Amino acid sequence: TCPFYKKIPGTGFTVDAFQYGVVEGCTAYFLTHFHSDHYAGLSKHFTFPVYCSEITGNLLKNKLHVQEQYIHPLPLDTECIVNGVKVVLLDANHCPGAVMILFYLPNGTVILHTGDFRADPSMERSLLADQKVHMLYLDTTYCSPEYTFPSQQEVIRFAINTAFEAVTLNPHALVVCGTYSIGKEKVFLAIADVLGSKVGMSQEKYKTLQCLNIPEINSLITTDMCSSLVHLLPMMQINFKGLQSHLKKCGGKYNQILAFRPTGWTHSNKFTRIADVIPQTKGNISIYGIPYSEHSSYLEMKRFVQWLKPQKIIPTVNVGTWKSRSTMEKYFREWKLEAGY
Ligand code: NI
Numbered sequence: 001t002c003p004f005y006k007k008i009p010g011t012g013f014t015v016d017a018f019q020y021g022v023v024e025g026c027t028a029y030f031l032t033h034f035h036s037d038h039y040a041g042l043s044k045h046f047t048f049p050v051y052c053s054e055i056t057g058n059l060l061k062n063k064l065h066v067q068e069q070y071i072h073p074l075p076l077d078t079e080c081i082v083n084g085v086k087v088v089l090l091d092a093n094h095c096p097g098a099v100m101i102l103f104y105l106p107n108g109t110v111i112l113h114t115g116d117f118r119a120d121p122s123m124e125r126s127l128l129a130d131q132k133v134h135m136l137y138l139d140t141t142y143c144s145p146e147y148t149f150p151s152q153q154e155v156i157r158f159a160i161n162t163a164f165e166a167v168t169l170n171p172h173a174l175v176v177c178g179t180y181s182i183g184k185e186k187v188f189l190a191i192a193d194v195l196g197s198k199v200g201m202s203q204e205k206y207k208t209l210q211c212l213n214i215p216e217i218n219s220l221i222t223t224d225m226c227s228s229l230v231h232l233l234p235m236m237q238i239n240f241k242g243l244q245s246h247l248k249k250c251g252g253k254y255n256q257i258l259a260f261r262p263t264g265w266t267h268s269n270k271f272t273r274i275a276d277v278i279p280q281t282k283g284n285i286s287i288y289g290i291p292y293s294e295h296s297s298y299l300e301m302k303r304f305v306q307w308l309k310p311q312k313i314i315p316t317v318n319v320g321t322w323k324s325r326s327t328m329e330k331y332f333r334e335w336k337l338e339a340g341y
Pocket of ligand 1: 094
């Protein structure tokens, strides 16, 4: 059964609610982004309206085969009326196609649902600037001060310099990048760009990338592995066993692998600066874990909420334990006392 924090009061709308069967009284289902935890339940058999970004729509149609008559793409940054209610979709700075949703309720209440997001000071100059928000449905994935990580920009710089150095020292090294879902494409695109290569990958992954509206994409990716010295592999294969195995298939073209495993936060961010990071090594294989996050740091999230000044906050992540719920309510109260709302 559909939890409360996926329902939108005074509307017939749900958010990210495809795994509960038919939802009693839902006339339109919103999808914030194409990640498996949020889309779970959509298929060719779905026959209710789905509202989403254009990118999320290309994915539903081509990867899940949802029938075109039920896909309703909306432009960003644009007031739209859906079943008598004004809505706006805003960029969430998460993965390609990911949105937040503003709902302007018949009774005068204004609700922002963030979906999954990486809060940024640029969001302070979107359509949110105008006005009040009575309820915030907040992605609280990293709502604790111990969660610190660098900017995306610094992490890409480290990856670019690391790869360029290794291949310049050794023209016969292969670079491998792990992936399991959409998001974090900048890691493998930036490395391929500095090395003058296309990124090689499986037919299924190429298909997914082709749905993402990345300009000049045909110039950047390929299914011909032999013509590429940056390869994409499923994340689970990014280990010494998986990588040795891959090296055999390449036909004695290469004598070294350097691989990158993009992660979220890990405990070694407590102690090690991005500059100081070092790989796990076995023979001619090296593996770098790099903390490329598509979710707000604690500091980013605090800044966004203190700017927005919402009347009430409903968390959508870490809601399963009394301790988590209690801890999150305590941070929301300090933030409110500190900033004066
Ligand atoms: Ni997500």
